[PDB]
Amino acid sequence: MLDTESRWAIAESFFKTRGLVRQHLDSFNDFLRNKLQQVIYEQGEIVTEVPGLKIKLGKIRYEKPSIRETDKGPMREITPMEARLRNLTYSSPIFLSMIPVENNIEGEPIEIYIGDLPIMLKSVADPTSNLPIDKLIEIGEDPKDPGGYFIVNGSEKVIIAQEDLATNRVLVDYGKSGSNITHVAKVTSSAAGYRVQVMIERLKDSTIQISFATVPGRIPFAIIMRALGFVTDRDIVYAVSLDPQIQNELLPSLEQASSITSAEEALDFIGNRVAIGQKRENRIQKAEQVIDKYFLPHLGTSPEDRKKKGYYLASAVNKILELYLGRREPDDKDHYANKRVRLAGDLFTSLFRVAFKAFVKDLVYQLEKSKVRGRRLSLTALVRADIITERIRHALATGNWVGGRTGVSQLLDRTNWLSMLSHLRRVVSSLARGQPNFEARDLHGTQWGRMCPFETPEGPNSGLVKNLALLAQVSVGINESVVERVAYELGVVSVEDVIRRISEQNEDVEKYMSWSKVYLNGRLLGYYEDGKELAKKIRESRRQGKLSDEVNVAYIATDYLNEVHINCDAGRVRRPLIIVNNGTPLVDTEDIKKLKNGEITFDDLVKQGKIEFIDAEEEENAYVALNPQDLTPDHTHLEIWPSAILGIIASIIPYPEHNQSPRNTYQSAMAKQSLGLYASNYQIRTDTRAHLLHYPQMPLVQTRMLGVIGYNDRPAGANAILAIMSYTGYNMEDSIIMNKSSIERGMYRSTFFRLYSTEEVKYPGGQEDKIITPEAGVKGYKGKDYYRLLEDNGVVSPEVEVKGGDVLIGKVSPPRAKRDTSIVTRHGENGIVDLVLITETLEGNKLVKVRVRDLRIPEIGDKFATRHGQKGVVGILIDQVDMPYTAKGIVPDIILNPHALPSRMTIGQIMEAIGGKYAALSGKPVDATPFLETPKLQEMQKEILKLGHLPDSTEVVYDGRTGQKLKSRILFGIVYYQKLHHMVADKMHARARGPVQILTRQPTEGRAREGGLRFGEMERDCLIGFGTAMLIKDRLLDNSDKAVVYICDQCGYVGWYDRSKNRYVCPVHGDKSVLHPVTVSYAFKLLIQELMSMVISPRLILGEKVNLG
Amino acid sequence: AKYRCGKCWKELDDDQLKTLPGVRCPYCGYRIIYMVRKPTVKIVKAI
Amino acid sequence: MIIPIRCFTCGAVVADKWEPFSNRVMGGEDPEKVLTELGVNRYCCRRMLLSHVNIIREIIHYTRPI
Amino acid sequence: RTLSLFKYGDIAPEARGFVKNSFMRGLSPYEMFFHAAGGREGLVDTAVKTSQSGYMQRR
Ligand SMILES: [Zn+2]
Ligand SMILES: [Zn+2]
Ligand SMILES: [Zn+2]
């Protein structure tokens, strides 16, 4: 029998063999091995309008990452740390083998340099992926870094997985109520560069219309069928289905095209739809080319592929008719069988395809222009490779991907270990924030084991941004041809063969109406006798290694449906399960014995047909058991790890099954923000913002996954003696009380690091150059005392006390009369200069980086949290003398109000307190993994009693101020706490007076811009509700954009008052009118002026200030 | 002022006088250099 | 990073008891007996000793080049 | 069926989201899943409520 230890051994072997970022690495490796060559085979060869001149492409390859610096010669290999320090890009050159034919002359193969491709860390192309720990340490690398990102311009960028509906599949649904359309079907064909949507309607009058983007309006179904080669109506009604009931519905659509009985009539009907006012010939060729290119490109873009498109359309029409007759239900659209996850590999292959198309277009244009001008054939002289390197890099550094995607590439969140780990496993839904729909944010039952039910954001993105589960695995896909061949040789019969047997041979259709339809990637493949037998055969052949493991098969049987679905494409999220045969799992005692001593690994069990990865579609035929002790002969699979339904951050909560649901989501959100050690080499890498906890501690109450992910080596908190009591009222309403004496001993102290950088631009456009020197006499000088910290080279030296707006790096800029452009410390924050770095940015330009550190000591207003969703600020700090000591002299480190517990219902908090106290007393390990907690509470309480303390974890407490013994006992524990980066020292901002806008003459915006608070409409409404007129005037007029303007007494426009001698002058009346001054908001005067910019003429009518009577 | 070669952390020391076409350690040819601690008594309060 | 000089809750010196405790536990001795015979009896100091990580042994390799 | 742990066409109280345990006693894995599914709506409704309230109050 499989106990807890054996299942944990299986899971630990899984985590040890393949890491936590296997999805990114697998997708990138697949793209690098296959998808790179496939793009240039798809290109094939470039043609030229000039006959006899063309190029044939060959192989493509990549080398080790390297750079080409000033005085370019041989390329020099670099390490990722050097790329980080020098603001380079960790990329490798790519070489392409090309052969030029000039009037059918071969010549010789040429291998050229076509650009640089970024390399993901720890991938197959990264030389540091197969290095020992000693060599990783030697080159300045963190041995525990799970590299799944890119170094672009020194920054670390990660490609977020994008979840979206499957493309080459038919989705059916009901039409909107009160409309002529009753049922709708949609397909989204994906080509090698473009995506085309085809929509099929079923109108009120029992007609079927097909309309896609290119051709305006709707086209009847029989018209498209005739245009694709189906001339006889019997051919159409037999390609749709063999059911007489379904065939009866085709009659209105069949007769609506009775006028058109030939392919050419349909073709020029489509031409008239697309081409207006042209002859028949060009119309028909335009129509046939648009049909062959923009109808269903995934099936093919060749004029002999029309039969496949016709059969696909017939199958889609059959599906919509089945929906109409009531034999189906509208598709879920949230079932994970209908969703695919695009990863870095697919995005990179699309981006590289686009960039290669642009590069080859430019190359052919330049080649033909040069040949028109007249020159010899030298490929290396006109490649202009810098296109490719520019196109890919700009995609990674901005996140604006091809196809309209935005935000795909994001900066890695290195706040701590958990932030980076959670970022490397995020999944973002594409169709989001356009409408709630109250159903895409639901917790679908298909997500079990694939997405974490807790780690989701709060707000507009709730339920749309998800995180992968522990054992989830994204499929990579194989080629459909081998699956099609094995399916055909298994015994299925093509639809054409079945139609022939039905029609040209006197065989009844009743025989084939009892057969099972067989699909492949959403496309109808054929007919089979018994679908269940075929599914069993495919499953058995897959487990024996004869068939690829990427193939998943399901069998669907209903009162009206009998189908077999086969999927072998990429983007499907699958999970592993142990195969159960006759009520006994295929993993036995010998297997776990061999697993516990390293003889076999997790991958060995998978390739032996004992553990299989199944997806959502196949799981419809599964009957899984949670534990080995409730297995039955009807069960098919067994869960490897019941606690593996959680994410990577929800796996750190102790006793998560005793808390309320929202608390775990809040815990995940806050744990993504705690302070602590984020990297071992943090002292040599340059990040814009960094935090460091001085004395981190690993939790006393652990979980099984804390040691696997390496959190015990990069902890982000400390253990605090927590008391649960009401004390002084300073911990009411989410606030907490902290010991000041323990703070003065350095409990939660931290350091904050900020970075400043500068570069000496060479300005090749005019040959002037920058220089980093002090600013004795310069145009934009600041002050003599400000530049007092700079050295003789114009750079401040380490270990000096900077303050306010002191100059760190001093450089001057040539006029575009030298101007002082020096980097100054940000206003309102000071520190000590920590590090100064000087290097060159691959072109001889001098790059200077200055890192400044400052010390953060906890105070009133700092934010702390737990692993159970208990955030709050410090209300007050109490010394050790004033704290309520117990009978042994132990004072609490943090006091927590009891009134916060009964409403939030976090029993795990008290359970963790008791467990931590037991762990500290006994010295024994405590495991708080959900559903498998050891030791139990009763054992821990008995051991606590045996060790000299009360079993209920309560203590006798005396008052530290008066010495009087409290009448009750107080609960003490060792709960683990975390400090968040929301410190009060970065949130204050006040403004009295200062700079104003140049346009509206109103106070500026921003903490660094001396401040300014916005007085919105709702505050004005509160002031009106109180009925305070003078307070409104003071808040809204006297303290912002007040001005005095002169208005003419006749026209009503604004005049002025010049200093020539003395005059009230009007723009139109000159000196023949009297002008009066009025105080007014300057924004109103701006509004008047910009209204006169348009043809509107606003005339102000004045009135007497003093009310007569 | 005075610099220090970045290769192997605290490698060796060099000054302003090393005039080269680019920012480079004259001894090991490394492209990254740092700055020294400007030897001077610094007073920090042990609070 | 390195063992704190004093216990956070009470001002008891605990830094001098790290290199014995860290060794004898690695020698196969149970932590409770070692902690009891070393003179650590309040569970705050036991918490201080039992949950130290000692990162500085890794950071000495990656030090500021100042 | 909601999850794959239950038989086809089961409408028993356990298979549709009845939790017979307590927070003190602890929940089984599928009970945790059902609890999260039931409680997800609160994380969503707040922004919609506040936006609609603001628009109505402004008018
Ligand atoms: Zn006038
Ligand atoms: Zn050197
Ligand atoms: Zn102590």
DSSP type of residue A563: E
Let me know: does A298 contact A186? Beta carbons within 8 Å: no
Mutate to test the interface with A, among D7, D10, D32 (most CBs of A within 10 A): D32
Say yes or no: C60 contacts chain A, CB-CB below 8 A.
no
Helix (H) or strand (E) holding A590: helix A589-595
For the record, the structure tokens of A333 come out as 């659209």
Q: Show me where the domains of chain C are located.
A: 1-66
With CB atoms and an 8 Å threshold, state whether B4 touches C65. yes
DSSP type of residue C6: B
With CB atoms and an 8 Å threshold, state whether A463 touches D27. no
With CB atoms and an 8 Å threshold, state whether B35 touches C66. yes
Helix (H) or strand (E) holding A835: strand A831-840
Burial A2-31 (b: 16+ CB within 10 A, else e): beeebbbbbbbbbbeebebbbbbbbbbbbb
Q: What separation in angstroms does the CA of A102 have from each of A98, A377, A379, A900, D10?
A: 13, 8, 12, 83, 73
Residue whose entry in the numeric block shows the structure tokens 């473009």: A194
Which ligand is nearest the CA of A1071, by number? 1
Let me know: does A121 contact A142? Beta carbons within 8 Å: no
Q: Which of A299, A80, A93 is nearest to A189 (CA)?
A: A299
Closest residue of chain A to D57, computed from CA coordinates: A1018
Give the CA count within 13 Å in the CB-facing half-sphere of A14.
23
What are the backbone angles phi and psi of residue A1038, rounded to the nearest 5°? -65, -30
Closest residue of chain A to B47, computed from CA coordinates: A744
Q: Which residues of B touch C66 (CB under 8 A)?
A: 4, 34-37
Q: What letter represents residue A198's amino acid?
A: V
With CB atoms and an 8 Å threshold, state whether A137 touches C55. no
Let me know: does C20 contact C33? Beta carbons within 8 Å: no
Nearest to A799 among B16, B31, B38 (CB): B38
Judge residue A144's burial from the number of C-beta atoms within 10 Å of its C-beta, 0-12 exposed, 13-18 middle, 19 or more buried. Answer: middle
For the record, the structure tokens of A908 come out as 């795990």
Nearest to C53 among A697, A834, A836 (CB): A697
Is B5 marked within a binding site? yes
Q: How large is the angle between the packed helices A907-922 and C43-50, nearest 10 degrees? A: 90
With CB atoms and an 8 Å threshold, state whether C53 touches A719. no
Pairing of strands A1042-1048, A954-958: unpaired
Q: Which residues of B touch A139 (CB under 8 A)?
A: none
Which ligand is nearest the CA of B29, by number? 2
Let me know: does A452 contact A650? Beta carbons within 8 Å: yes
Pairing of strands A701-702, A637-638: unpaired
d(CA A316, CA A324): 12
Q: What is the distance in angstroms between the CA of the first residue and the CA of the last residue of chain D?
A: 46
Is B34 marked within a binding site? no
Resolution in A: 2.9
Residue whose entry in the numeric block shows the structure tokens 């981190």: A696
Please name the residues in contact with A248: beta carbons below 8 A apart, sequence gap of 6 or more. Answer: none
d(CA A214, CA A308): 20
The catalytic site residues of A sit at 734
Pairing of strands A863-865, A976-979: antiparallel
Q: Where are the alpha helices (DSSP H) in A659-806?
A: 661-671, 704-708, 740-744
d(CA A879, CA D6): 57
Closest residue of chain D to A658, computed from CA coordinates: D23
Q: What letter represents residue A783's amino acid?
A: G
Q: Which of A924, A911, A507, A897 is nearest to A737 (CA)?
A: A897
With CB atoms and an 8 Å threshold, state whether A441 touches D44. yes
Bridge partners, residue A1057, by sequence? A1064
Q: What separation in angstroms does the CA of A68 have from each of A88, A346, A681?
A: 11, 29, 27
d(CA A438, CA A436): 5
What are the backbone angles phi and psi of residue A499, rounded to the nearest 5°? -65, -40
Distance from CA of D19 to the nearest CA of A (A): 12
For the record, the structure tokens of A253 come out as 């659509």
Let me know: does B35 contact A795? Beta carbons within 8 Å: yes
Which ligand is nearest the CA of B28, by number? 2
Chains that touch B (3 or more CB pairs under 8 A): A, C
Q: Show me where the domains of chain B are located.
A: 1-47
Let me know: does A700 contact A925? Beta carbons within 8 Å: no
Nearest to B32 among A85, A792, A795 (CB): A85
Report yes or no on chains A and B touching (3+ CB pairs under 8 A).
Answer: yes
Q: Which of A36, A27, A130, A141 is nearest to A81 (CA)?
A: A141
Pairing of strands A573-581, A584-585: antiparallel
Say yes or no: B4 contacts chain C, CB-CB below 8 A.
yes
Nearest to C10 among A696, A719, A889 (CB): A889
How was this one solved? cryo-EM
Residue A455's Cα: distance from chain center in Å?
14
d(CA A862, CA A839): 38
Let me know: does A966 contact A727? Beta carbons within 8 Å: no
Other C-beta atoms closer than 10 Å to the C-beta of A924 total 14
Mutate to test the interface with A, among C62, C64, C66 (most CBs of A within 10 A): C62
Q: Which CATH class is domain A170-340?
A: alpha beta
